Structure formats: C-alpha cells, structure tokens
Design a protein around this ligand. Structure first.
Ligand SMILES: *[C@@H]1O[C@H](CO)[C@@H](O[C@@H]2O[C@H](CO)[C@@H](O[C@@H]3O[C@H](CO[C@H]4O[C@H](CO[C@H]5O[C@H](CO)[C@@H](O)[C@H](O)[C@@H]5O)[C@@H](O)[C@H](O[C@H]5O[C@H](CO)[C@@H](O)[C@H](O)[C@@H]5O)[C@@H]4O)[C@@H](O)[C@H](O[C@H]4O[C@H](CO)[C@@H](O)[C@H](O)[C@@H]4O[C@H]4O[C@H](CO)[C@@H](O)[C@H](O)[C@@H]4O)[C@@H]3O)[C@H](O)[C@H]2NC(C)=O)[C@H](O)[C@H]1NC(C)=O
Ligand SMILES: *[C@H]1O[C@H](CO)[C@@H](O[C@@H]2O[C@H](CO)[C@@H](O)[C@H](O)[C@H]2NC(C)=O)[C@H](O)[C@H]1NC(C)=O
Ligand SMILES: *[C@@H]1O[C@H](CO[C@H]2O[C@@H](C)[C@@H](O)[C@@H](O)[C@@H]2O)[C@@H](O)[C@H](O)[C@H]1NC(C)=O
Ligand SMILES: *[C@@H]1O[C@H](CO)[C@@H](O)[C@H](O)[C@H]1NC(C)=O
Ligand SMILES: [Ca+2]
Ligand SMILES: [Ca+2]
Ligand SMILES: [Cu+2]
Lengths: 248, 1262
C-alpha cells in the first residue's frame, strides 16, 4: 500500500502490482531512471508554467471562448493540440464560438450526455450543472502549453489532497489568477442551498482549476457556477476524456 | 451578591416507597432557624434533601446538625469550597480545624461556608443555573443508599429573584432518578428500590405545569453501582444544552440541565425507557393544564402503515464468519429451541388506504425488520393512517414530536380509548405537527434521529417486533430525499426478547421439538429467545453495505429493544462526526438516537460492531465496502480491445513530518498494592530498533501507570511503530482515530484483503511488524480552540481480554507546531488518565469476577506525579475502555474544568463512557492535595481514586541557604578537600573559604545532601564556585537525587543533567518544571574546572505554601493582643510581652518573665482564626548575659474553646522543639499538620540566662 503511503515516493502516477508498486508519468514525460524521478520529455511538455493577473506565459494553457456578439463568454483549458476542455453550460448559449492575456475555428464539440442544464434541472427535479463538462476540438492543430491530465487515483489521493489550487479565472481587461483552498465535502454540501453532486467540488466559468505538484501542473477541475466556488470534479471524468482523446 | 443561610440536618425517618412496610432512613432536611420548627419542604422532594441555590458572588452557609446514628457530612460536586468545607476525608495533611468538616458524629454540628466563585459559574454556553448533587461523603455507598442526598444549583449572576426562583423559566423542577439498595443502608434490609426522588412504584407526586409554559429541568441520576438512565417526557421534547432531544442520557452520579417548552394539554408519563426501569414501575406524570396564557416549503406529509403478523428470520444467509457457539446458542434450532425465525408483528407501508398494494416488493433491503422510515421538517404536518392487521390491538407512537393527547398514541395505566390503541382490522389516523420547539438546533445535524412504536405495552409490543426509525429535519432534506448528504443510513441496535412477545407460545407451539415439555423461563431456553439484532439481523451476513469513496454518508443510530447497558459502537479507518466532533466510537443510551456523518475518507472493506457480551459481538455487527469505481474497463479495453459508446452530444456550428517509535509487548508482574500481585503483558518503548535497551522513565511518566508510552504526533505527520511481540500469546497494535490502511489495522474479520494485508492482524511471540499510521486533519484537533486530540491503542487479537491483561496505551495529536526541543508539549501541563476496572478473570494470564481492581492506570489509589501549579493551564486526557458496565463519572475535587473545544461549557463532573476519550482543560483555583475520582460508589471506594496536588504559583522563593534559616547542621557532603565545608555551601558567601569543594578520583562521584528536615517543594537550583583570583574552581555540570525517606531516593529527569557555572562567581539558575517534593535533596557534580567547587541555594515553597509573616515583626499584630504570663518590670527597665518581635534591636529588645519557670508562657491573640505553619524564635542581648530559649513547647486553641498542646504525629506527647543557640539567631520551626487556632502559646522548657525571645508567626488567612 506504498503508493497510498506518500505516493510510493513517486513524482507522478503511482499504481499497483500484486506485491509491487508501479510508477508512471504524465503525458510528454520521461520516467525516472530511478523508477520514480520522472522528468520533462520535451520542450512542449504539459504542466510547465514558468519555472492577480496571470502573467502571459504563466497560464500557457488557459483558453478563451470568443463570441462574435458577446466576445469572451467562457474560458477553457488546452488539453492537446486538437482538443480543449470546457464547461457544458458554456456551449450553445452564444451565437458563435472560437497565448494572450490582453483582453481559431472550433470544429467539433463533445457535450457530456448526462449534463443537466438549469432549465433541464427544472424539468426533472435534477442536480443543476451536474456533469458540467465538455470537450472542444479545433479545426487546425494549435502550435505550442497544455495542462497535464492526471489519473483518478492520483487526483483523488495526491492532487486534490493539497492546501490550495490555482483558478486562473479572468470582467477585467487582463487575465486573473488566484489560489483556492480545498474545502470539505460536507462543509461544501452544508454551505450551499444548491445540492452539489458527487461529480462536483468547491474551493470565468470554463476556466482551468489545476493542482500543482513537483513544479508541475495537473488539471483537477473546471469552473462551474457560483459561499464557495463550485468545480467539476475531473476525477470522475478521466476515462470519459481519454475516450474522446483516444479518438482517432 | 448575597449571604444565603440554610439550616440543614440529618435524621432518621420511616420512609415508604409507596404512600397511596416502611424503612428507616437517614436523610437531610431543612430545619428552620435555630432548628425551631423544621420547614414546609415540598412533597415532591421525597427523600431528596433540600435543594440549595446561590448565584455567582453569593455565599452559602449550612448549619448542619447530625441527628443520625452515624457520622454524616455535606459535600458538593461543585468546587465552591475549601478543605474546611470539603466534607470529605482523605490524606490531605491539614489541621484538625480542616478535618472538622470531614465527618460529624451524632449530636455534633458544623458551619459550612461556601464561596460560589465566578470561576465555577455557568457562564457562556451554559443555562442560567447548572445542576449538581451533594451528599454524605463519609461512606457515600452506605450513606447515600440510606437517603442522605440532595441537589445543589450553581446558578449564574442575575438569574434569580428574591423568591430565589429562576426568572428565565416559568417553572423549575428537580428530578433525581435514583436506585436505592436498603441492603446497604446501615439499617440493612434485603430490598432494592427504583425510585424518582424516593417515590417507587410510580407514586411520585403529580408535577404541575400550565399549558404553553417554559420549564427548566434539573435531572439527577444516581446510585451506588454503575447505573444508566434515559429519562423521557411523553409528547414533549427538551434541549439538553443547545441540542434538541426527547431522551435524556443521565448516568449514576451525573446531573442534567434542560429547558422544555410544553404545548399540549393533558397528563403525560415520565419514565426511563429502559427495560428494567420500566418494569420496576419507576414513573411519574407531567400534569399540564391550560391556564388562558397565550402560546412556505411546508408540505403536510401522509403515510399509510399497517401492523402485519409475519414470520421473521433474524438468520438469513448466515455466513461462516459468525461464532459457532452462537448459531448453536441462539440460531440453530437444535435442542428443542425455536431456532432462527419466530412470529413477528412488524410495520409495513402502503400507497393507499385500501391497504392492498404495499409500497415495496421485498421487505426493504437493509432495514431488516425495521418498519417504514418516517420523516418531516419543521412546521410540516405529517398524517399517519394506522391499520392493525395483527391478532391483538396495537398503536403508533413517535418521539421528538409534541403530539397531542388526541393523537398521542400511548396507553397509560390509568385508563379503561382515543386512537391510543387501535384494534385488529381497525383503522386510525394520527395527525400531529412538527412545532418550532421540536425543531433541532444549529448544533444538531441536518436531521435529528428518533423512533416510533406501539404504546399498548411498549416493551412487550417492541419485543414482538414493532419498531421504526423517524427523522426530524430542519428545512434541508428536500423532496422527500436527504440533503447535504449522499447516503441516508440506519443502524438500529434492537434487542428483541421473544419471551416478552405476544407470540411467545405461537412460536413454541410451532417451531419447537416437543412444546409439551417446553419450559419457558428455563435459563438456557430463555436466553435463547432473547436475541440481539442490528436492523433485525441477529448476525453478520454474506452481503456487505457498500459505499463510495470521498462521499459523506449520514447515519442514524438508535439502540431500541430491552437494552439494559449502554450499547457502544465501532467503525474502522472511518470515524463518526457527532456533535461537531470526531469519535471512532459511539455509546448509545437506550431509546435516544444519535445522528453522525461518517465520511468515506478511507477505502477498503471494514467492520462495524458493538463490543461487549459474547452476544453483542455477533448479534450486532456488519461489514461495509469503501472503494472507487475503477479502472477503467473502457480505456484498457480500447487499448487491448473493444471500445464502446462515447456518451457525448456533438456540435460545432458557428460562422507533514515523520515520527517513529520502537514499542514491544513485554511480560510483567503487577500487584495493585505496593494476592494483589499478578502477571501481565504490558508495552514499553525502546531506544531504537535494536531493542534490549528499553527507554528509561521520566518524571512526568511517573503517573502514566500501566499505560504504554505516549504515541504523540501532529496532523499530516506519519507514524512508524516498529512493534514486536515478546510474550506467551500473539498480540497486535490497533490505533484509534488515526488513518491506518488494512496493513496497519490489527484485526481479523471478513476483510476481503489478501494475506498481504492480514499479516498485521496478529503477531505471535517474537513476531515483528511495522505499523505506518497516518494523521489526517480529521484525526487531530478540530478548530483552533482545541489543542490536542486524544486516541487510544490496544490489542487487536482480542481487544477486551487483551486490554484487561495489561495491554493499553495513549495517543496524542497536538496542533501542528506544539511540541518542543525534546518530545514534550510546551506552555501546558499534561496528564493521561485511564479509568478502567481491570478484571484478572478476563486477562489471558490466569487459572462465547472476584479479582477486580477498580483502579486508574492500573494503580488503584496510589499513582503520583500529579503536581500542578495554581492557575497554570493543565490538560487531562481521559481514556476509558471497559464494557457497558464501567461508566466513570470523573471528578476533580475543589476544581472546575471545561472540556476542550467547548470552552463555553462548564460542567465539573464528566461521565466518561466506554470507549471514550476527551481532553479537558484545568487551571486549578485551590492549593494543596486533592482527590480525583469517580462519583461511582462501588469503584470510588474500591481503588479508582488517585490524589493530586497543586502549588502556589509563586513557588520559587529563596528557601534558606543564603539566610541560613537552614541549620549548618543540615548540610552534609560525601567528602571535602581542604577547609571547604558543606556547612559553608551558601550563595554569595564570602571568606577565604566560602564553599564546599572536594577532590575527584577514579573512585566514586561526590555529592552534597541538603536536608530540609521536612518534605517541601523545590522548583530551581543555583550554582557557583569561589574565586581565589587566578583560577575559580567551579562546577560545570551536575544532577539531582531527592528522597523523602532518608536513604532510598530517585533521580530527577524532566532533566538528567544540569548546566554548571561559567566561572567562580556567576550565578547560574536552573528550573524544574515537574516540581520535586521530598525531605532530602542531593547535588552530584559531573563536570568542573579545577575541582567541584559548590555553594548553592534552593528555590521552592512549602507543600501548602502558606508560610507568610503574620505581622509580629511587621507590627500588623497590635501589642494589645500580645498577652503574657508575666513581664519582668524592674524599677529601671521591664520587658513587656508586646516587645517580643523578630529582628528587633532598640531599647529592651524582647520579652522576659519576672518569674522564670516551666509555668511561663507567651500568648499571642489573633482575634480571628488564622492558619499557622511555621514560627521563628529569637533571643536578647543586654548587660548580664544574652538570653534565649533552649527548648520549648506550643499550646493552641481548639474547635470548642479549650487549650490543647501541639501533640506530635511522630510521638506520644506534644513535640518539644530546639530553641536558639545564641541571641541574634533565628530557628524556624514548622508544624507537621498546620495549626488552625486563634491563640498560640509558647511554653519554654529550657532557656539560657533569663527567658527572652522574639517571635515571628507564619501563616495564611484561611
Ligand atoms: C414496584 O416496586 C419496585 C419498584 O417500584 C419493584 O421492585 C423491584 O423491581 C425491579 C425490576 O423488576 C427489580 O430489579 C431487579 O432486581 C433483581 C434482584 O437482584 C438483586 O439481588 C442480586 C443478588 O441475588 C442473589 O441471587 C442471584 C440469583 O441466584 C445471584 O445472581 C446473585 O449473585 C445473588 O447471589 C444482586 O446481584 C442484584 O444486584 C446487586 O448487585 C449488583 C452488582 O452488579 C449491583 O449493581 C446492585 O446495585 C445490587 O446491589 C440485586 O441486589 C436483579 O437481579 C435484576 O437485575 C437483572 O435483571 C434485570 C431484570 O429485572 C435486568 O435489568 C438484568 O438482567 C439485570 O442483570 C442482573 O441479572 C442478570 C441475570 O439475568 C445478570 O446477568 C447480571 O449480571 C445482573 O446481575 C433487577 O435489577 C428489583 O429487584 C425489585 N425489588 C424488589 C421487588 O424489592 C417492583 O417490581 C414494582 N412492582 C410493580 C408491580 O410495579
Ligand atoms: C523467541 O523464541 C524463543 C522463545 O519464544 C527464544 O529463542 C531464543 O533465541 C535467543 C537468540 O536467538 C537465544 O539466546 C535463546 O537461547 C533462545 N531460546 C531461549 C529459551 O532463550 C527467544 O526468547 C525468542 N527469540 C529470540 C531471537 O530472542
Ligand atoms: C384506493 O385505491 C384506489 C385504486 O384505484 C387506483 O388508484 C390509482 C390512482 C392508481 O394508483 C392505481 O394503481 C390504483 O389501483 C384509488 O382509486 C383510491 O384513491 C384509494 N382509496 C379508496 C378506494 O378509498
Ligand atoms: C548576591 O548575588 C546574587 C546574584 O544573583 C544576588 O543575591 C545579588 O545580585 C547579590 N547581592 C546583592 C545584589 O546585594
Ligand atoms: Ca477537610
Ligand atoms: Ca488487516
Ligand atoms: Cu468524591
């Protein structure tokens, strides 16, 4: 149960063998010659930032949904050169949708099949913004940095087990940033009149909520709505994202 | 403020537990002034003495006159007294003036003066007036059972009227639930009575209260041996300290303060809903009667439930797990026993009045034999339609709801029927509403737990299977689902006893082998039927209650049935979140539920169970899984395999620090009286992983007793316990509270983990393991207010039988940062107390109850190390672990404490429940030796009771080496080189030879003993050597070695060695946090420059720290009071007996008698009684010879105006002290047990020249 014990002294993803403890790495990373070290494999490796307003180059991943009429309506998080993560309630609420901190065509967009919009949250007395998650696919490959995608376990027992998280939430003319502490689940559930589902968690909507580790950046959640702020517990939608990535 | 004066007295009386054979008892009773006409005294107080009151700042006097056959006393649970009002007798080394209260013989009287301080007042979060008990401490177990007992009320400032009655409440009633055993009452009778305020068989006079009133209840449960209650007021809910309720949990020797709020007219029943209590007839009435006085989200609910006579099987899918001797004693139907299933009459819910189609397909999954789960918010109107289908009549009764007598649903013994008891085929509809007074508080959880059953024969009705959980919730649980939580759970610990059912013979005449001989009540047989359940399941099953990870499941526990003991309960890795606190265990008073919220912070399968009877172990348990969802199937599947749906709608249009210990389960011999000497398995720490080098004892650890080492850590830290057995049988390490994996659990149950995680389950002798435990936020202190969280650690193999064998330890988790240089907490005092009644008949070492030692830390009575200053933050971590029978209402005498986290809650007495451990903060107000305790009679007197001690904050005052007041005849050394003497080892002392200094050798180490000639308190040393000029020759390092019995002594270690001087003059001072107390002290130097040069002085105070100049020398004592037997007045000069002052030079300095004889005396009147501890004696110089008293005696005043010589405790006659040897010399003499008189005389027996002297009394104002 070492992995559980300080994360098998591992830099990133600690897993399990029958009497073992398998150490993995994030995308674009080289595992430690030790068997745990784990280092940047390339120059466009995710997570690497620069080491209020988030300096240009500090939030290399952050994304901005632009509408012809309303301009920047929602934020996003670049996962890969083709797909960028956003919120479900951020799509089909504006006439259109399309490396900058001073206030790209969208090909396809996958809205989780279980997302519950306010209106629909009314039609069947269901959790509002439940499954507030979606993935946008660019028409042309973006030239690089993206954020690193973590594993359910790693995110549950290592990442979300931090003191505070980063929420580069932009209405200012320049980009914003801030650190938000991870609040208890009961604290959260008893702190809002809105019932939060086991998909959410609390501590601009569409922006990235990342938890830092070994000078690296792991996407943990994404802006929801809203007392504390609500986020989409990306822990529960890791396989759903890999599904769409493993697209081809 | 005010001066309250009561006239109380003991006296016999022919009490009859039924007033509609009587017993002669000794009880209290308020006689009027001068004891003229007694007084009214209500007819409700029964045996209970007269209730005392008194705000804050007031003062109470009690004129006690003992008209009894025995010596009685008066004694308050509240620290509003001193040792001359304590009313208790122990080893406190006080004056016969302070033991006059301890006991009062027949005919004798006494004035009890109490000062109700502000330190002991209710204050912030407590009601206007707190409840407390008082009673004859002399033999409590024998004195109470007699009747000597009453109630004290430490009201708060400005909460009373002239009436003396409380102003906040419209009413005020004192209820003492007491169990009396005349077989202990001096006038022994073989009888046992369960009474409220002395009235048995439910004859307690009718209480009275108009409708819409606000009552202030002051309940007091008590007995001789461990007794627990659970009072209840029908169709009425209370607020036990900011918590909505309905069932009050009072233990033997505890008090309860709650504020009710009636709302429904009619006479209600008052009982303790316990099995035994209820059959003993113990009950009363709340006779409410209207009096004209005046008193959306809402969605009136509606339930359709019905009584169905079904066949219930406690044993469905009984899995291997269960104990064999169990499924043979209770389950298996062999031996003519009924077996597993009996005929039941349970509840069932329908969707319509036609009572045709039920609201389920299978009997609910998981809620066993539990009826439908009712629910409702505040201001909602629930409507139940009850339909009896069973053989005999039944009813519906709910708790925590101000139901009306028209919809009460309960039958009283005083009735011939209004929907109270519906009959077969009959239909009735209860219509009650959830009043705001029934609403739960801000402390309560979203939902308060409660129950409902039939009131036809409640006990016998339930045994036949009529129970159902009922939740009352604020405006949250919305729909009608829960809210805030992702899982509403229920765990009703019901104990159904067939032999108390209505089908008792419908089962025997059906499921029996030959009912013919079926002998109901035949032990073996009876116990069979009376089986234990959890949600109706009389044993663990094959299915596991599965929950998710990181999700918060809200529970709702409630021990129903005929439970007589306190039903504790246990989790694992996971913890309950009760009353805003975390607890790895929960004790359940019968019939009063509790609502925790155990979040799933840990994964893996775990066990939940109540640990007590070989019946409670299996009859009440279950397992629950706690994992994720994982994998996925999908990602791996795609990679090696067959991909599935996406689950999306397309669219795009738009132009902590470590910490390790090395423990080991060693084998030791233990006797509880240093035949009282048994063998036991204990713990003990080792220096490192090598072992064989056990870490040595310290000063603090001088109280821990048997308890293993203190496993201490901070939040987020990780513990690495390298445990290794060392005994005859295998043992294990289990840790409470902490977050331990299945590899660090230490317990074998249906855990699904592999052998990889079982190896920790138990370690056979020599076995070696490592327990990596983890401290997460929820295992330490909750909120800043709290400083350190308490947890225990014991055996896993067999907890109870292992924990009794001498295996147990303390765990402390303090705030991140609160631990100093060396592993100890700073800025606070620390004590860990283990209240447990060891039973060497349970321990493994001894030939599924004669040798009991009700002791604390395995040391009944003795112990030690309980020395704390006055006013200094001292905490007390309390740990209990006994079965359901050892409750331990812990008590600090003359002290008052708050329980950490709750600094706004006073108490002063704290029932320590089984498997409980809470930390409290002290800061004592009185100085001296005091008893700490259990208010539980049986144990109190049979071991469980250790004495503690306090020292005046100012206790570092020079103690007599510079001043010499300490004879040179007291200082001695192992040897000295040169003219240097031990006699010359004083501070700042000058001369060619000013210190003591020997010559070190390859021989032994040198020492220098300082005899104080009597036990004292030291808290500091001071050192230096003398400078010749070129070299100083001083001591560099050293250590101490005290001892009160002359020769045998211990070494000090708080620590081992102290800092020596830097030169041959500089004064280096050292401190001693754990104050030393001994007749003798020694200084052994280790390092030095040139030679162990030593001159010193002690810093401490007296055991009582009273010694203060009374004014002789100062003059405070006028010379008018200074009488004498005769003062020589010659034509020239005379010495008046008021010229006898210390350090006085000028004129005729002193006092000498005209006639020098053994008949002379010097009387110093103090007018008012004062405490005297030590008196110095001087001499006089003038013309012919300089005089002084060579020896003397001392006479003083007695309780009743009579002279008495200061007799010796170490001899037959009054001590004869050795006076001065000169003129201008001092010679302080102390008084073993202080003198508490107003008149001191000094009869000189031997003198030099003409009897002359200068006196300087020492004492406090008492
Ligand atoms: C109106 O009048 C009054 C009230 O208004 C009522 O009278 C009282 O009614 C109640 C309830 O019915 C009775 O309570 C019960 O009392 C019995 C009697 O036990 C006493 O003597 C015991 C010793 O007896 C000897 O012989 C037995 C059997 O051979 C041996 O076991 C013993 O060792 C003895 O040799 C003694 O042990 C009892 O306790 C004493 O010692 C214990 C130490 O543990 C102390 O705590 C006590 O203070 C006390 O000093 C007692 O003195 C008890 O046995 C009953 O307790 C058991 O049974 C209960 C069911 O009633 C139930 O709660 C538990 O089972 C409880 O557990 C005890 O017995 C178990 C056996 O099943 C054991 O497993 C367990 O270890 C424990 O021993 C119970 O308390 C009063 O006695 C009775 N008084 C009277 C009649 O004068 C009356 O009912 C009312 N009537 C109406 C119509 O309203
Ligand atoms: C456990 O095994 C037995 C007792 O259970 C003992 O074995 C001893 O081992 C030590 C060192 O190997 C020897 O000195 C002894 O001679 C062995 N036997 C006895 C009776 O002393 C020992 O108590 C435990 N094992 C060890 C290694 O201590
Ligand atoms: C008793 O039930 C009656 C059954 O009619 C049906 O009610 C429908 C609303 C539906 O639930 C069906 O499943 C039932 O079979 C119902 O009409 C009455 O309201 C009920 N009360 C009576 C007959 O007094
Ligand atoms: C004597 O030495 C000690 C130094 O601590 C102290 O009593 C004082 O300084 C000296 N005497 C004095 C100051 O009169
Ligand atoms: Ca006393
Ligand atoms: Ca295990
Ligand atoms: Cu006491």
């Amino acid at each position: 149960k070492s992995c559980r014990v300080d994360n098998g002294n591992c830099w990133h993803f600690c897993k399990h063998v029958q009497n073992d403890i398998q150490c993995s790495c994030a995308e674009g990373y080289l595992l430690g010659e030790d068997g745990h070290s784990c280092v940047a494999g390339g120059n466009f490796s995710c997570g690497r930032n620069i080491k209020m307003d988030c300096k240009l180059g500090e939030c290399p991943w952050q994304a901005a949904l632009v509408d012809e009429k309303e301009g920047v309506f929602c934020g996003g998080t670049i996962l890969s050169p083709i797909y960028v993560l956003t919120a479900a309630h951020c799509i089909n609420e504006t006439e259109t949708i399309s490396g900058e901190i001073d206030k790209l065509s969208v090909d396809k967009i996958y809205v989780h099949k279980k997302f519950v919009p306010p209106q629909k949250a009314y039609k069947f007395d269901l959790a509002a913004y439940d499954y507030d998650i979606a993935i946008i696919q660019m028409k042309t490959p973006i030239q690089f940095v993206p954020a690193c995608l973590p594993t359910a376990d790693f995110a549950n027992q290592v990442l979300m087990k931090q003191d505070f998280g980063i929420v580069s939430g932009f209405k200012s003319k320049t980009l914003k940033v801030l650190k938000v502490p991870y609040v208890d689940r009961h604290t959260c559930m008893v702190s809002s009149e809105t019932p939060i589902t086991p998909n959410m968690f609390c501590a601009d909507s569409g922006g990235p909520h990342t938890t830092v580790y070994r000078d690296t950046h792991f996407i943990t959640g994404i802006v929801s709505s809203g007392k504390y702020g609500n986020y989409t517990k990306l822990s529960k939608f890791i396989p759903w994202i890999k599904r769409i990535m493993r697209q081809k | 403020a005010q001066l309250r004066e009561y006239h109380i007295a003991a006296q016999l009386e022919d009490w009859d537990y039924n007033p509609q054979l009587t017993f002669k008892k000794i009880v209290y009773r308020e006689y009027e002034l001068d004891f003229k006409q007694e007084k009214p005294r209500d007819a409700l107080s029964g045996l209970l003495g007269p209730t005392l009151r008194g705000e804050v700042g007031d003062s109470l006097i009690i004129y006690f006159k003992n008209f009894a056959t025995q010596p009685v006393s008066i004694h308050p649970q509240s620290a509003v007294y001193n040792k001359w009002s304590e009313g208790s007798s122990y080893s406190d080394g006080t004056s016969d003036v302070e033991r006059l209260d301890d006991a009062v013989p027949p005919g004798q009287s006494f004035k009890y003066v109490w000062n109700i301080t502000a330190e002991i007042g209710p204050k912030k979060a407590d009601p206007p007036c707190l409840t407390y008990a008082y009673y004859s401490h002399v033999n409590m177990v024998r004195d109470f059972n007699s009747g000597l007992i009453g109630a004290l009320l430490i009201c708060k400032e400005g909460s009373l009227n002239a009436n003396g009655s409380q102003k906040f409440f419209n009413r005020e009633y004192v209820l003492m639930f007491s169990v009396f055993d005349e077989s202990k009452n001096w006038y022994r009778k073989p009888s046992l009575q369960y009474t409220i305020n002395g009235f048995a068989n439910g004859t307690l006079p009718d209480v009275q209260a108009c409708a819409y009133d606000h009552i202030s209840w002051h309940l007091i449960g008590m007995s001789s041996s461990p007794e627990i209650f659970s009072v209840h007021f029908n169709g009425q809910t209370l607020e036990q300290n900011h918590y909505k309720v309905s069932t009050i949990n009072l233990v033997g020797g505890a008090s309860v303060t709650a504020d009710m709020s009636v709302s429904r007219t009619g006479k209600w029943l008052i009982s303790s809903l316990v099995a035994k209590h209820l059959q003993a007839g113990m009950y009363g009435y709340l006779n409410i009667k209207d009096c004209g006085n005046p008193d959306m989200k809402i969605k009136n609910w509606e339930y359709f439930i019905a009584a169905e006579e079904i066949t219930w099987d406690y044993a469905p899918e009984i899995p291997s797990s269960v104990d064999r001797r169990y499924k043979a004693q209770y389950l298996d139907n062999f031996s003519n026993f009924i077996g597993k299933k009996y005929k039941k009459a349970v509840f069932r819910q329908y969707e319509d009045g036609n009572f045709t189609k039920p609201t389920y397909a299978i009997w609910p999954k998981e809620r066993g034999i539990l009826g439908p789960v009712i629910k409702a918010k505040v201001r909602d109107t629930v409507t139940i339609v009850f339909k009896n289908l069973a053989s005999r009549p039944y009813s519906i009764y709910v708790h925590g709801v101000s139901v009306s007598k028209d919809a009460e649903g309960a039958i009283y013994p005083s009735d011939p029927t209004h929907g109270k008891a519906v009959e077969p085929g009959q239909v009735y509809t209860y219509k009650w509403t959830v009043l705001d007074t029934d609403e739960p508080t801000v402390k309560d959880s979203e939902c308060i737990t409660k129950l409902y059953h039939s009131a036809v024969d409640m006990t016998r009705d339930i045994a036949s299977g009529l129970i159902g959980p009922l939740l009352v919730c604020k405006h949250k649980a919305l729909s009608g689902v829960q809210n805030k939580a992702d899982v509403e759970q229920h765990a009703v610990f019901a104990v159904f006893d067939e032999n108390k059912s209505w089908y008792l013979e419908d089962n025997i005449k059906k499921y029996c082998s030959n009912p013919s001989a079926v002998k109901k009540d035949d032990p073996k047989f009876y116990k069979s039927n009376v089986m234990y359940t959890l949600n109706g399941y009389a044993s663990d099953r094959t299915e596991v209650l599965r929950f998710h990870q990181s999700e918060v499941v809200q529970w709702h526990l409630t021990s129903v049935g005929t439970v007589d003991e306190i039903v504790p309960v246990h989790l694992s890795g996971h913890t309950f979140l009760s009353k805003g606190k975390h607890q790895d265990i929960l004790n359940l008073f019968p019939m009063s539920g509790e609502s925790a919220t155990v979040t799933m912070d840990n994964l893996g399968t775990w066990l939940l169970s109540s640990w007590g009877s070989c019946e409670m172990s299996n009859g009440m348990r279950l397992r629950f899984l706690d994992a994720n969802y994982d994998d996925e199937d999908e990602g791996n599947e795609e990679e090696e395999e067959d991909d599935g749906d996406i689950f999306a709608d397309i669219f795009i249009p738009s132009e902590g620090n470590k910490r390790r210990y090395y423990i080991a389960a060693e084998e030791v011999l233990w006797d509880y009286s240093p035949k009282t000497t048994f063998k036991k398995a204990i713990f003990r720490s080792y220096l490192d992983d090598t072992f064989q080098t056990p870490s040595t004892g310290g000063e603090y650890e001088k109280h821990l007793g048997i308890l293993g080492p203190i496993i201490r850590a901070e939040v987020d830290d990780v513990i690495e316990i390298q445990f290794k057995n060392l005994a005859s049988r295998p043992y294990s390490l289990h840790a409470h509270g902490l977050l331990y994996e299945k590899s660090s659990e230490g317990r074998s149950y249906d855990d699904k983990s592999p052998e990889l995680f079982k190896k920790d389950d138990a370690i056979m002798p020599n076995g070696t393991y490592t327990y990596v435990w983890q401290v997460p936020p929820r295992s330490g202190p909750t909120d800043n207010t709290e400083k350190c969280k308490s947890w225990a650690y014991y055996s896993g193999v067999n907890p109870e039988k292992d924990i009794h064998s001498g295996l147990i330890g303390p765990i402390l988790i303090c705030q991140k940062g609160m631990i100093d240089k060396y592993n100890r907490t700073i800025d606070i005092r620390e004590f860990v107390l283990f209240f447990m009644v060891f039973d060497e008949e349970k321990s493994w070492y001894f030939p599924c109850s004669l040798h009991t030692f009700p002791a604390i830390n395995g040391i009944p009575y003795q112990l030690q190390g309980l020395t704390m200053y006055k006013d200094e933050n001292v905490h007390w971590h309390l740990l209990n672990m006994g079965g359901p029978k050892d409750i331990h209402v812990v008590n600090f005498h003359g002290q008052t404490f708050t329980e950490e986290g709750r600094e706004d809650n006073q108490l002063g007495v704290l029932p320590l429940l089984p498997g409980t451990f809470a930390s409290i903060k002290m800061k004592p107000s009185k100085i001296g030796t005091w008893l700490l305790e259990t208010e539980v009679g049986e144990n109190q007197e049979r071991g469980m009771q250790a004495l503690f001690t306090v020292i005046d904050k100012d206790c570092k005052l020079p103690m007599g080496l510079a001043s010499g007041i300490i004879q040179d005849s007291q200082i001695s050394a192992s040897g000295h080189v040169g003219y240097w003497e031990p006699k010359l080892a004083r501070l700042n002392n000058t001369g060619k030879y000013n210190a003591w200094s020997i010559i070190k050798k390859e021989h032994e180490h040198p020492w220098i003993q300082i005899d104080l000639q009597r036990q004292v308190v030291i808290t500091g040393i001071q050192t230096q050597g003398t400078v010749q000029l070129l070299q100083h020759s001083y001591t560099v390092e050293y250590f101490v070695t005290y001892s009160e019995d002359g020769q045998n002594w211990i070494t000090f270690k708080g620590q081992m060695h102290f800092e020596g001087n830097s030169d041959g003059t500089t004064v280096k001072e050292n401190h001693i946090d754990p104050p030393i107390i001994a007749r003798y002290i020694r200084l052994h130097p280790t390092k030095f420059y040139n030679r162990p040069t030593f001159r010193i002085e002690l810093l401490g105070c007296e055991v009582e720290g009273c010694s203060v100049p009374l004014g002789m020398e100062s003059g405070a004592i006028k010379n008018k009071e200074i009488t004498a037997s005769s003062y020589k007045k010659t034509w020239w000069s005379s010495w008046e007996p008021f010229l006898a002052r210390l350090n006085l030079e000028g004129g005729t300095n002193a006092w000498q008698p005209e006639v020098n004889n053994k008949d002379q005396w010097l009387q110093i009147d103090l007018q008012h009684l004062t405490k005297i501890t030590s008196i110095i004696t001087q001499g006089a110089t003038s013309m012919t010879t300089s005089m002084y008293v060579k020896t003397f005696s001392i006479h003083y005043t007695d309780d009743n105006s009579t002279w008495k010589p200061y007799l010796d405790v170490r001899t037959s006659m009054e001590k004869v002290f050795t006076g001065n040897i000169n003129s201008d010399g001092h010679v302080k003499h102390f008084f073993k047990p202080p003198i508490l008189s107003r008149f001191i005389r000094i009869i000189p027996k031997t003198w030099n020249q003409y009897i002359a002297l200068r006196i300087e009394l020492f004492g406090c104002e008492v």
